[PDB]
């Protein structure tokens, strides 16, 4: 649902916010805005009128808050590219939940017209950690395991593909993966 979508569209009628999209339409190499942090939602919602957009905040907390209030205007068109909980060279694997969210968003960006994953993405919000962290290019090329009712598939092949996707095998599922 998009509760404050009309209130934000109400706020975008200001000539200054109307200016921001006039300049962003020409797409200049340099554009520096300045305003209170309370206006982050409006500026992102403004730049989103021209197309997709990436918003980067400093800490994961600010990204969570910005993604949250941005879902009040665009709904499923906003999505967070989350941070790792472990540094890239730490003897500790990151969160299975966050790795899932990252890989799910990378394929949503690759497949905007795929209803199986969600709505087409207009705003993606992330952190400086995930902005600066390099990735392998072939992460999206890893085929997921799509299971719908009526899909003809082999049982042992789905099992062998799940472990290939680093799923742990258990006698009884208790955690994700």
């Amino acid at each position: 649902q998009t509760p404050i979508a009309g209130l934000v569209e109400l706020a975008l009628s200001d000539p200054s916010l109307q200016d921001v999209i006039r300049r962003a339409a020409d797409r200049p190499a340099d554009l520096a805005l300045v305003g209170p942090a309370s206006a982050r939602v409006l500026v992102a919602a403004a730049l989103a009128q021209n197309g997709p957009l990436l918003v980067v905040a400093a800490t994961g907390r600010e990204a969570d808050e910005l993604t949250a209030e941005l879902r009040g205007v665009f709904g499923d068109s906003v999505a967070l590219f989350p941070s790792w909980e472990t540094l890239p060279h730490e003897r500790l694997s990151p969160g299975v939940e966050t790795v899932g969210a990252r890989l799910m968003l990378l394929r949503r960006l690759a497949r905007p017209d795929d209803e199986t994953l969600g709505a087409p993405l207009r705003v993606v919000v992330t952190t400086t950690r995930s902005l600066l962290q390099p990735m392998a290019p072939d992460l999206v090329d890893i085929e997921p395991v799509t299971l719908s009712v009526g899909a003809e598939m082999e049982f042992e092949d789905v099992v062998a593909r799940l472990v290939d996707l680093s799923y742990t095998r258990v006698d009884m599922v208790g955690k994700r993966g």
């Binding site: 800490t59 909980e85 500790l92 990151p94 969160g95 208790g174 955690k175």
Partner: protein
Amino acid sequence: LEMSLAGIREMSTILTPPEERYPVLTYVGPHDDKQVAAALRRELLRDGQAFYIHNRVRTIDEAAARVRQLVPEARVVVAHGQMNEETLEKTVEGFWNREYDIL
């Protein structure tokens, strides 16, 4: 025991379903000074706090000194049950209000 006492002592056993629980990332392995120090600096970087466990109270001051050797810029106290109750409730309320980094 809950239903055995259903008539005597009623309960509303609310708990966190493991589907909504973000678990703690656990590392197991040998002790390393740089690894322990780096892991405390990361927590302190986000303005967090940390528990350092040590049960032998007779050598707990040595333990605080040892973590101060690992991270000299951290503020570190000890808290144990052989203390005066006031100094412990004092040390504890200080730790909660972020007056100390490592407990």
